[PDB]
Amino acid sequence: TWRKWNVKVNHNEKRYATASAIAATAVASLVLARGHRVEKIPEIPLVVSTDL
Amino acid sequence: AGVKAYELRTKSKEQLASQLVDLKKELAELKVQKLPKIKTVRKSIACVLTVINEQQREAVRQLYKGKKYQPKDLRAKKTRALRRALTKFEASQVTEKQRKKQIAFPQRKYAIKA
Amino acid sequence: SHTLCNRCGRRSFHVQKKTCSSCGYPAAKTRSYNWGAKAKRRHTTGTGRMRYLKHVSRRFKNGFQTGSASK
Amino acid sequence: VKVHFDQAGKKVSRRNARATRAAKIAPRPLDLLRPVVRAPTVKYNRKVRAGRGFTLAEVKAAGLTAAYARTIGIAVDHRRQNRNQEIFDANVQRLKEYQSKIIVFPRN
Amino acid sequence: SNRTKFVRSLVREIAGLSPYERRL
Amino acid sequence: GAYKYLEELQRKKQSDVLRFLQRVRVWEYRQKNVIHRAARPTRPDKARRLGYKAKQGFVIYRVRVRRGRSLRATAEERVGRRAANLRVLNSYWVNQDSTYKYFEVILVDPQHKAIRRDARYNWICDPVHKHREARGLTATGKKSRGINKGHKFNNTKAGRRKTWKRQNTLSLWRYRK
Amino acid sequence: SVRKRKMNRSSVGKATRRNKDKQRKINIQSNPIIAANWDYSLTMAQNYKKLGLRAKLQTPAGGKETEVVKKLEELASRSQSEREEEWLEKLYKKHGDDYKKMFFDKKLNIYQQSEGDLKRRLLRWKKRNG
RNA sequence: AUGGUGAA
RNA sequence: GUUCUUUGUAAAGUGCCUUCGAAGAGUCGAGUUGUUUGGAUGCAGCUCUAAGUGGGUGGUUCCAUCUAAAGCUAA
RNA sequence: GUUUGACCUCAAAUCAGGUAGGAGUACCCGCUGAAUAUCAAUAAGCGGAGGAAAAGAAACCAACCGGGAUUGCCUUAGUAACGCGAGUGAAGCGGCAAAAGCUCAAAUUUGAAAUCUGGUACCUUCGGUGCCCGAGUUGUAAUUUGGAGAGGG
Ligand SMILES: [Zn+2]
C-alpha cells in the first residue's frame, strides 16, 4: 500500500504547462489535429457574450 | 383465515381460556388424521395465547402503576450499559457554585464587525 | 481418552483430566490464544445463531424505542 | 508503515467540523482574541506571534474583567507576566479595538 | 503565620524527641 | 481547625506516641483477615485531603501485603478485585513493621444514588473509570508510570510504549517530502 | 470477517443509514437573522463576508453594513418583599429620615443593616410607593 | 524461544 | 415567539477604604540493591529521613521560573 | 443494681434496593516477557476500559526585549548526545489542526447539620412535594483553590 501514487510537480512547471495548453487553443490547425470538428467555427478563439 | 386478534382483544380471561381449550382439542383431534386446517388452528392457538399474555402483562403493569421498583420483566430492555451511564437528571446535576458562576457570567452571543 | 463436552461438544473433554482442551471447560474463561488465529476464527462470534446479537444493531438504529405504532 | 491517503479526507472532515461549529456558533467568529507575543530564542525574537491569552494586567487596563472578558471571546492567560511597555500598549490597543468592534445581543 | 508556629511548637512539645534526636 | 494539629503530629512519625499507636494498631490488625471492612479511617486528615467524605457511598478497607508491582499497587489491585462493585479512588499508608506493611484504601460506590447525584463525585460513575488501579490511573499508579513534566520524564512523560511506537513508525505522505 | 459474512447471509437485513449528504449540509441554529440572510451555496468565510462579519480574528493561514444594521437595531429591542416593605415602613415611621438614629434601633432593626443599605432601601421604597 | 496437546 | 410564575429584607459583580490572610510527611531527600534509557534520569525491595519569607529545576556573589507529594475535564 | 439502659464490635435472613465475573479485542492502559552490546520494553502470556483510550491545565520550557493545558503533523534532525565500532538516537524554540477551565485539604454556619440515602401517598414520573426512618458531629451543605481569598463600610 505504500507504493508511490502521486507525483510531485513544480508549481512553475505546472503553470508553464497550463499556459502552453491555453496558447495551443489559439491555433485552428492545432485544434483540428486534436480531433475537434471546429471546421465551421466563425472565429478562433471563440468569444461569446456574457449572457451565455 | 383463522381468528382475528382485534376481535380477541375484548374477550375476557375465562372466554380466552375456553377458546384456547377448544382450539387445543381441535388440534388434538386433527393430529390423529395427519390438511391446512392444522396450520390454521395452530396459528389460532398462538394468537389466543399471545392475547392472554398481553392482557396479563397489562394487568401486572396496572397493579404496579406508578410505584417504584417494578418487576424487572416490565423494565426497559434497552441494554446493560444504558441502565448505567447515569440518567439525564444525574448527568445534568451541577454544584451551586458552578450555577452561580454561570448565572453571573453566562456565555454571550456576539459578532465582530463594529 | 476424550469425550463429548457439554459447553462445546467437540469431543475433547479429557476423561482423566476432566477438562476440555478446546474450550477450556470447566474453566470460566473460554480457551483461546493469539497464535491460534484459525482456532479463534473457528470459534469467533458470528459462527453460531447469534439469537440476540443480531437485533442489537437494528434496535440501536431506533434509539431503543419502546411502545407501539400510533396508526 | 502509515500512508496518509486520508489527507484529503482529513481536510474535508476538518472543514465539515468548522462548518458545524459555525452553524452552532454562527454569531461568534469561532476564535478568541489573542495577544501579540515576542518569542524567546533570539533566532526568533524578531518575530512577533499570537499568544494564548491576555494577561490579567492587560485585561484590567482594557476596562474589563477576565471573567466578563472570557464570555465576550477574549483569551485570558494568568501565567504570562508583563515586562515590555510596547507589547502591553499593543495588547491594550487590540483589546480596545475588539471592544469597540464587538456587538453583544441583549440577554432579555 | 503565628498560629502555624504555635501549632508546630505544641506538636514538638507533645511528641518529645525522636529516638535519633534523643542521641543529642 | 484540628486537622492542622493532626498533620503536624503525623509529621513526627518516629515520636514515642506514634510508635506506641502503630505497634498497638498493627497487633490489633494482626488478628483480623488480610482484607476487611474498616468502620472509619484511622488518619482522618489524610483521607479528607485525599477526597474522602463521611457520607453514604464511601467505604474504607484495610489490606495487608507481604513486605519485599509496588506494595501500594498490589493493595489497590487486591481491593479492586475483591470490591468489584466499588471504584478505588486513593489509598494511604497507615502502618509498617519488619514483616508486613499496611495501607488504607478509600472506595466510592457508584451504584449508591448519593454518589450518582453528587455533582462533585458522580464523575467516577462513568464506565471509563472502571478498575482505575488496573490501568494504573491511581495516584500510586501514575507515579509508578513516570507521568510528569520536565526533562526528568521526557522518555516517560505520557506513555513509555507510545513513544517507542511513534519513533518506530514510518510516516509517508501522498507527496514525498 | 465471519460476522460480516453471517450478517450478509442472514435474512434479518442491514440497518441501512444514508447520511453522507447530510454531512455537507449544516443549517444555522444559533441566530434568526443569520438564517434569513445566510446562503448555503457559499462557504463559511464567503457567507461571513456577505453578511459583513469576521470569520477569523488571527491572521489566517494560506492565501485568501446593510446586514449588521439589523444586528445593531436588535440591541434596542426587582422590588421589595411585603415583609421587607412592612419592616421598612416601621423604621421610617419610628425614625423618619434619621438614619443614624434608625441604625441604633435595637427592637426594630433586627438585622444590623448599615446606614447605606438602610437609606438605599428606604429610597427604593419611597420611589416605588412614596 | 512463547503458548498448548496426550502420554505412568 | 407563545403562557404561568417570581420575592426573599435572596445570590452575585464593579471601584474605593478598612481588619485579617490556610497551602497534600514514611512525603522530598541521601544510601544500597534489581530494572529501563543512545537519555545519565526515571521505575522498584529496604536502613534513615527533611523545612516553611520553606521546597524543586538551571550559571557564573548568588540571579531566572513554579509551588510537587489529590482529583475531573470535549476538541 | 445477686438489675436496667447508651453505644462500639462481630455473626446470621431463601430480607428490601443494587453491582461484579464472561464474551469480543485492530487501537488504548498496566504487569510480565525470549529465541553483557544487537533482534527487544518486539514475539507470546495475564489483567482492565471506550468509541476512541492515555495525558491534560507546570515544583514546565528557557537564560531570552522571554513563551504559558494536553495531544497529533512538518521542521528542529539523522543534529545534540551516547555506544565513537558496527549502530541507537532525543527534546526547547518556529509553523500548522483544535483551544475551556476547574473541584477538595486546608482559617467557626455555631444566631439554629442549614446536608444527604431509603420507606410511605400523590403529581406535571430519567423527577418534585408532606411525613417518617437512618447516615452524618471522628464533619454532611454554602462561602476560598494562590489569578489569591475572607469579616465589615
Ligand atoms: Zn469443550
3-state secondary structure C55-69: HHHHHHHCCCCCCCC
* Cβ-defined contact of B78 to C56 (cutoff 8 Å): no
Residue type, E12: R
| Three cell numbers, residue F72 | 501500594
How far is CA C68 from its chain centroid? Answer: 33
The count of structural domains within chain D is 1
Distance measured from the CA of protein residue B110 to the C1' of nucleotide J100, in angstroms: 18
Give the three-state DSSP class for E8: helix
For residue A42, the surrounding DSSP H or E stretch is none
Distance CA D104, CA E13 (A): 63
Distance CA C53, CA C50 (A): 5
Q: Where does residue F105 rank: exposed (0-12), middle (13-18), buried (19+ CB within 10 A)?
A: buried
Distance CA G65, CA G51 (A): 8
Sign of the alpha-carbon torsion through B94, B95, B97, B100: positive
Sheet holding F100-108, edge to edge: F35-38, F58-66, F100-108, F87-96
Q: If you classify domain B69-114 with CATH, what class do you get?
A: special
Distance CA E13, CA F12 (A): 11
Sign of the alpha-carbon torsion through F21, F26, F27, F28: positive
Q: Does the nearest atom of strand J lie within 7 Å of D21's Cβ?
A: yes
The annotation status of C6 as a binding-site residue, yes or no, is: no
Cis status of the peptide bond prior to A45, with omega within 30 of 0: yes
| Three cell numbers, residue C15 | 476423561
Beta bridge partners of F90: F106
Distance CA B30, CA B27 (A): 5
Resolution attained, angstroms? 3.3
| Three cell numbers, residue G112 | 444590623
- Close Cβ partners of B20 (under 8 Å, ≥ 6 residues apart): B45, B48, B49, B52
Q: In terms of residues, how long is chain G? A: 130
Beta bridge partners of F59: F107
Give the three-state DSSP class for G73: helix
- Counting as contact any 3 or more CB pairs under 8 A, the partners of G are B, C, D
List all nucleotides in chain H with at least one atom under 7 A from a protein Cβ.
2-7
Q: Does the nearest atom of strand H lie within 7 Å of C14's Cβ?
A: yes
What residues make up the domain containing D16?
1-106
Question: According to the entry, how was the structure determined?
Answer: cryo-EM
Going along chain F from its start, the domains and CATH numbers come out as: 1-177 (3.40.1120.10)
Distance CA D39, CA D80 (A): 12
Chain G contact for B113 (CB, 8 A cutoff): yes
List all nucleotides in chain J with at least one atom under 7 A from a protein Cβ.
8-10, 16-26, 28-32, 41-50, 52-56, 58-75, 89-108, 115-123, 125-127, 134-145, 147-148, 152-153
Does E contact D via 3+ CB–CB distances below 8 Å?
Answer: no
Return the closest-CA partner of residue F140 out of F92, F102, F177.
Answer: F92
Indicate the Cα dihedral angle F158, F161, F162, F167, nearest 10°: 120
Give the three-state DSSP class for C14: strand
Nearest CA in chain C to B76: C66
Q: Does the nearest atom of strand I lie within 7 Å of G112's Cβ?
A: no
Compute the distance from residue C37 Cα to the ligand 1 centre, in Å.
18
Indicate the Cα dihedral angle D99, D103, D104, D105, nearest 10°: 170
Q: Which residue has the cell 495551443?
A: A24
- Close Cβ partners of C22 (under 8 Å, ≥ 6 residues apart): C5, C8, C10, C12, C31
Degrees to nearest 5, angle at CA D36 with D34 and D38: 140
Distance CA F74, CA F95 (A): 16
Range(s) within chain B of domains with CATH label 6.10.250.3450: 69-114
Residue type, F108: V
- Counting as contact any 3 or more CB pairs under 8 A, the partners of D are A, B, F, G
User: Could you give phi then psi for residue G112, rounded to 5 degrees?
Assistant: -75, 70
G116: left (phi over 0), alpha (psi -120 to 50) or beta: alpha
Q: Mark out the alpha helices in E1-24 (DSSP H runs).
A: 2-15
Q: Which of D71, D98, D100, D108 best probes binding to B when mutated, by most B CB atoms within 10 angstroms?
A: D71
Q: Do residues F99 and F26 touch, judged by C-beta distance below 8 A?
A: no
Return the closest-CA partner of residue E21 out of F15, F95, F17.
Answer: F15
Nucleotide nearest to F74 (CA to C1'): J31
Q: Does the nearest atom of strand I lie within 7 Å of F95's Cβ?
A: no
Distance measured from the CA of protein residue F62 to the C1' of nucleotide I61, in angstroms: 54
- Close Cβ partners of D88 (under 8 Å, ≥ 6 residues apart): D57, D58, D61, D82
Give the three-state DSSP class for D104: strand
How many other CB atoms are there within 10 angstroms of residue D51's CB atom?
17
The DSSP secondary-structure symbol of B105 reads S
Tell me the chain B residues in contact with residue D73 when contact means C-beta distances shorter than 8 Å.
110, 112
Beta bridge partners of F87: F108
Distance CA G121, CA G123 (A): 5
What is the gyration radius of the CA atoms in chain B, in angstroms?
Answer: 28
Return the closest-CA partner of residue G58 out of C71, F146, D53.
Answer: D53
Distance CA G126, CA G122 (A): 6
Q: Does the nearest atom of strand I lie within 7 Å of F23's Cβ?
A: no
- Close Cβ partners of F138 (under 8 Å, ≥ 6 residues apart): F73, F76, F88, F89, F90, F91, F132
Tell me the chain D residues in contact with residue G26 when contact means C-beta distances shorter than 8 Å.
16, 19-20, 22-23
Compute the distance from residue C10 Cα to the ligand 1 centre, in Å.
6
User: Could you give phi then psi for residue F94, rounded to 5 degrees?
Assistant: -130, -20
How many other CB atoms are there within 10 angstroms of residue B22's CB atom?
14
The annotation status of C23 as a binding-site residue, yes or no, is: yes
The annotation status of C69 as a binding-site residue, yes or no, is: no
Distance CA F134, CA F143 (A): 14
Q: Do residues G78 and G67 touch, judged by C-beta distance below 8 A?
A: no
Give the three-state DSSP class for B49: helix
Tell me the chain E residues in contact with residue F9 when contact means C-beta distances shorter than 8 Å.
11, 14-15
Q: Where does residue D30 rank: exposed (0-12), middle (13-18), buried (19+ CB within 10 A)?
A: middle
* Cβ-defined contact of G12 to C47 (cutoff 8 Å): no
Distance CA B49, CA B55 (A): 10
Distance CA A39, CA A37 (A): 5
Q: Strand D2-3 and strand D36-38: pairing?
A: unpaired
Compute the distance from residue F94 Cα to the ligand 1 centre, in Å.
48
| Three cell numbers, residue B9 | 382483544
CA distances from B30 to B21, B23, B43, G118 (A): 14, 10, 14, 98
Nearest CA in chain F to B99: F119
Distance CA F28, CA F62 (A): 12
* Cβ-defined contact of G53 to B114 (cutoff 8 Å): no
Nearest CA in chain A to F170: A2
Return the closest-CA partner of residue B107 out of D105, D61, G72, D95.
Answer: D105
3-state secondary structure chain F: CHHHHHHHHHHCCCCHHHHHHHHHHHHHHHCCCCEEEECCCCCHHHHHHCCCCCCECEEEEEEEEECCCCHHHHHHHHHHHHCCCCEEEEEEEEEECCCEEEEEEEEECCCCHHHHCCCCCHHHHCHHHCCCCCCCCCHHHHHHCCCCCCHHHHHHCCCHHHHHHHHHCCEECCCCC
Give the three-state DSSP class for A31: helix
Nucleotide nearest to D30 (CA to C1'): J99
Q: Do residues G88 and G125 touch, judged by C-beta distance below 8 A?
A: yes
Distance CA B29, CA D38 (A): 98
Of G30, G53, G65, the CB nearest to B112: G53
Burial F28-37 (b: 16+ CB within 10 A, else e): ebeeeeebee
For residue G18, the surrounding DSSP H or E stretch is none
Beta bridge partners of F101: F65, F96
Q: Which residue has the cell 482505575?
A: F132
| Closest chain F C-alpha to A21 CA, distance in angstroms | 25
Distance CA E23, CA E3 (A): 30
Distance CA G109, CA C11 (A): 93
Burial B59-81 (b: 16+ CB within 10 A, else e): eeeeeeeeeeeeeeeeeeeeeee
Does E contact A via 3+ CB–CB distances below 8 Å?
Answer: no
How far is CA A35 from its chain centroid? Answer: 13
Breaks in chain G (C–N > 2.5 Å) following residue: 64, 77
Distance CA G86, CA G90 (A): 6
Distance measured from the CA of protein residue B77 to the C1' of nucleotide J56, in angstroms: 38
| Three cell numbers, residue B27 | 388440534
Distance CA G70, CA D105 (A): 11
The DSSP secondary-structure symbol of A45 reads S
The DSSP secondary-structure symbol of E21 reads G
Distance CA D54, CA D97 (A): 14
From residues 70-109 of B, list those within 7 angstroms of strand I by Cβ.
100, 104
Distance CA D39, CA D50 (A): 10
Q: Mark out the alpha helices in D1-108 (DSSP H runs).
A: 7-24, 56-61, 66-71, 85-101
CA distances from A24 to A38, A41, A42, C51 (A): 14, 16, 18, 68
Distance CA F69, CA F64 (A): 15
3-state secondary structure D29-44: CCCCECCEEECCCCCC
What DSSP string describes B51-98?
A: HHHHHHHHHHHHHTSS-SS--TTTS--S-HHHHSS--HHHHH---HHH
- Close Cβ partners of F84 (under 8 Å, ≥ 6 residues apart): none
For residue B10, the surrounding DSSP H or E stretch is none
Q: Strand D2-3 and strand F171-172: pairing?
A: parallel
Q: In terms of residues, how long is chain A? A: 52
CA distances from F82 to F37, F42, F62 (A): 11, 21, 12
Establish how many alpha carbons lie within 13 A of residue G93's alpha carbon, considering only the half-sphere containing its beta carbon: 7
Establish how many alpha carbons lie within 13 A of residue B76's alpha carbon, considering only the half-sphere containing its beta carbon: 12
Residue type, C28: A
* Cβ-defined contact of F127 to B90 (cutoff 8 Å): no
* Cβ-defined contact of F174 to A5 (cutoff 8 Å): yes
Distance CA B8, CA B25 (A): 19
Distance CA D36, CA D50 (A): 5
- Close Cβ partners of D3 (under 8 Å, ≥ 6 residues apart): A1, A2, F172, F173, F174
| Three cell numbers, residue F139 | 495516584
Distance CA G48, CA C71 (A): 46
B2: left (phi over 0), alpha (psi -120 to 50) or beta: left
Q: Which residue has the cell 467555427?
A: A41
Q: Do residues A32 and A39 touch, judged by C-beta distance below 8 A?
A: yes
- Close Cβ partners of F14 (under 8 Å, ≥ 6 residues apart): E18, E19, E20
Q: Does the nearest atom of strand J lie within 7 Å of F21's Cβ?
A: no
Q: Do residues D1 and D20 touch, judged by C-beta distance below 8 A?
A: no
The DSSP secondary-structure symbol of A18 reads H
Q: Does the nearest atom of strand J lie within 7 Å of F31's Cβ?
A: no
Q: Do residues F62 and F36 touch, judged by C-beta distance below 8 A?
A: yes
* Cβ-defined contact of D28 to B105 (cutoff 8 Å): no
What DSSP string describes G21-32?
A: HHHH-----S-H
| Three cell numbers, residue F145 | 508510570
Nearest CA in chain G to D51: G58
* Cβ-defined contact of F169 to D4 (cutoff 8 Å): no
The DSSP secondary-structure symbol of D54 reads B
Max CA distance (Å), chain A: 52
For residue D67, the surrounding DSSP H or E stretch is helix D66-71
Q: Does the nearest atom of strand I lie within 7 Å of F7's Cβ?
A: yes
Cis status of the peptide bond prior to F127, with omega within 30 of 0: no
Degrees to nearest 5, angle at CA B45 with B42 and B47: 110
Q: Do residues B15 and B52 touch, judged by C-beta distance below 8 A?
A: no
- Close Cβ partners of C66 (under 8 Å, ≥ 6 residues apart): B76, B77
Q: Do residues D74 and D95 touch, judged by C-beta distance below 8 A?
A: yes
| Distance in Å from the first CA to the final CA of chain A | 47
Nucleotide nearest to F86 (CA to C1'): J19
